[model samples]
Target: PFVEDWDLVQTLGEGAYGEVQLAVNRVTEEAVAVKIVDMPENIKKEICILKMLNHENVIKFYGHRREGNIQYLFMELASGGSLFDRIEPDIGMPEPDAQRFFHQLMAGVVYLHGIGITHRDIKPHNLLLDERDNLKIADYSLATVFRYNNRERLLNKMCGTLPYVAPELLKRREFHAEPVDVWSCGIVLTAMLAGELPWDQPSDSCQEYSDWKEKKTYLNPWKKIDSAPLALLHKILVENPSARITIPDIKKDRWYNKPLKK
Candidate 1:
């Protein structure tokens, strides 16, 4: 299938695992993203996760082909790129629009958790958009099956990028994997509304969090977002993992659950 059927039009992007290329399916004349991965373990993990998922807010996995030691994973091409491309310094999306995307993101994350998976890496760069501007969760190299243990399943891996990782993960060597995703969702939602990170990081030493905790004063950029969402953000960004709002709790929050404008 990789010999003469797919034409590499251009490279889409690159990650630590491999590179993604924009390719055209010769048989169907359809554009698709061909993720070229050299690590067979990573390929197997991604394929397993993609194959198990089927939701509107999740990327579609078409098929795959293995040639030599490299593996080519075919997926729906997201022409609109990632949500990271839309965030601006002082022109973040409106509350209503941000809410819509957050809702879709929560839906996908909830679905993933429902299927016993936890997306350890949840960030704006991992959130892709299609031609219709609909957000879809992408990149599963860091994803893992959370319900594998017979007892209480707590993960102890210190993975994922900075700024988006949970405070508990940084503070403790072992932590519940589910709540970590919630914390990252909070960061993403804040970034979407305020157009920047809520704080440099969730660490206690961070000046922004210090100011907010001590004097109840938000960072300069945080004041730009709507007050309602900011209140909800406070609940979602709790430093204590036990006190942090879960995805279901977020869905039920008044501001987040408010009906979006048509």
Candidate 2:
């Protein structure tokens, strides 16, 4: 039998490993997203990572259940939904609001780095928001840990959606995943502020690689937007991996935390 602690409601999300359902807790009557896993190996990995991960912005995992072929994981519900739900055609988010969202994301990423976990998939689809606009990092199914000391042995897995993938991942066919996470964050920031991507979505990964090598990176001149935070966007979206601003570096930078003068 499925874990009876919570009454399953509606389906929240799903991926290769399992489906997430909205479940109401029998005790507190609070709603939570229960993640049900089907594979034994995936269950072991998810449980290990969830146990070690604890952050205010990261979604909290409450409990787990293993009954026959079904496995369950109860987690806090993020009502604001995924970033995809927030995008609009012509109306972009306010600059200040977008700034807060970007910085909050950086804080969460920095926390992950501190704990040695690399969220290989860092895109709008994986970014969720709770009530009051608080962001919740989710979808750790593709994430992996890379200890500072053991990084040498870690596989250079080229895993991520195409449009936001870092150039080096396509160039060298291998690199540290942390830098790539930063690249994706920048793309997310751009899309939030400007209603579209700077470049045409690559037809495939091979074309993506070719596009990068040709030095074709540039914001579309036709965007015709006056208030697009160029400096901030440039800081995040640089093609050169070394030039890309990192989450920790941004958090430590004084100007980033200072209040702007009106």
Model 1 agreement with the true structure over 217-239: per-residue lDDT tens digits: 34566678677887887888787
What are the models' TM-scores? 0.92, 0.83
Best by TM-score: 1
- CA shift at 95, candidate 2, in angstroms? 1.3
Q: Give the poorly placed runs of model 1, Cα more than 4 Å off.
A: 1-4, 149-152, 260-262
| Clashes per candidate (backbone, < 3 Å) | 0, 0
Candidate that scores best on lDDT? 1
* lDDT at residue 106 of model 2 (Cα atoms): 86
Clashing pairs in 2: none
Tens digit of lDDT per residue, candidate 2, span 1-262?
2267678878898887778999886788898888888747756776777777788778887878877888888777899998767866455566566677777788788888788887787877788899888787887777777765655334477778877777776666557667788888877777776656655443334553345445444534214233335555556666677778877676655545655432
